[PDB]
């Protein structure tokens, strides 16, 4: 499961 990264 990917770590969340905001943009």
């Amino acid at each position, epitope marked *: 499961a990917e*770590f969340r*990264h905001d943009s």
Partner: antibody
Amino acid sequence: VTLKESGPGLLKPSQTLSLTCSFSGFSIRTSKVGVSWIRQPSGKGLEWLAHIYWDDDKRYNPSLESRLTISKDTSRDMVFMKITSVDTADTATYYCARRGFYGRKYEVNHFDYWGQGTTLTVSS
Amino acid sequence: DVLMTQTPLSLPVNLGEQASISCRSSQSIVHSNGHTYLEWYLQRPGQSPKLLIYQVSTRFSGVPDRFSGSGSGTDFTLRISRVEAEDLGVYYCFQASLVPLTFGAGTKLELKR
């Protein structure tokens, strides 16, 4: 920018660890930085525990997740960690780490500031 | 989960020599957003970990240009061109693309004798 961890120093096995990380020199609210807890058990390397985003979304390391609760109070510029049912293996230094970035590149984030840590020894 | 394997785990050097540390992830750590979240941290003896390199090859502010990060996908290298006394300590590679975020075991850069 400074980060300061606080913790009880010593606990008995089965107690709940309550950690605080207090931030100075910027605003959690305004910066929208994410924050992690990372620990270094006695004689071991670093292990990531948990992370909380600006909107209170959370992620955990499955190896310990069932025992972990991360939370924050933006109005106090604080992030917290609870670890239930401590035992000897929880003897470690606990670090708070800021997942900062250079504005406004939210996607280019990394652990830019770490505190001094708080050490815990667990013993009966 | 992603295993981060550093080689070697102990790296004795003479001050002034080059140093090289390899990090292999067990799967690709290219994130769906396009970035590869590979970071290098140094923990000097008796100090807190500090960021050296992020996004594989970008030095964090204040980090000397004798440090260089390279690699792609699963295959990463930290190079130090000329080791100085302040460089000795334990180096960790770290991936923040997949949960759990994971560190390597650490490579101790130590003085040779």
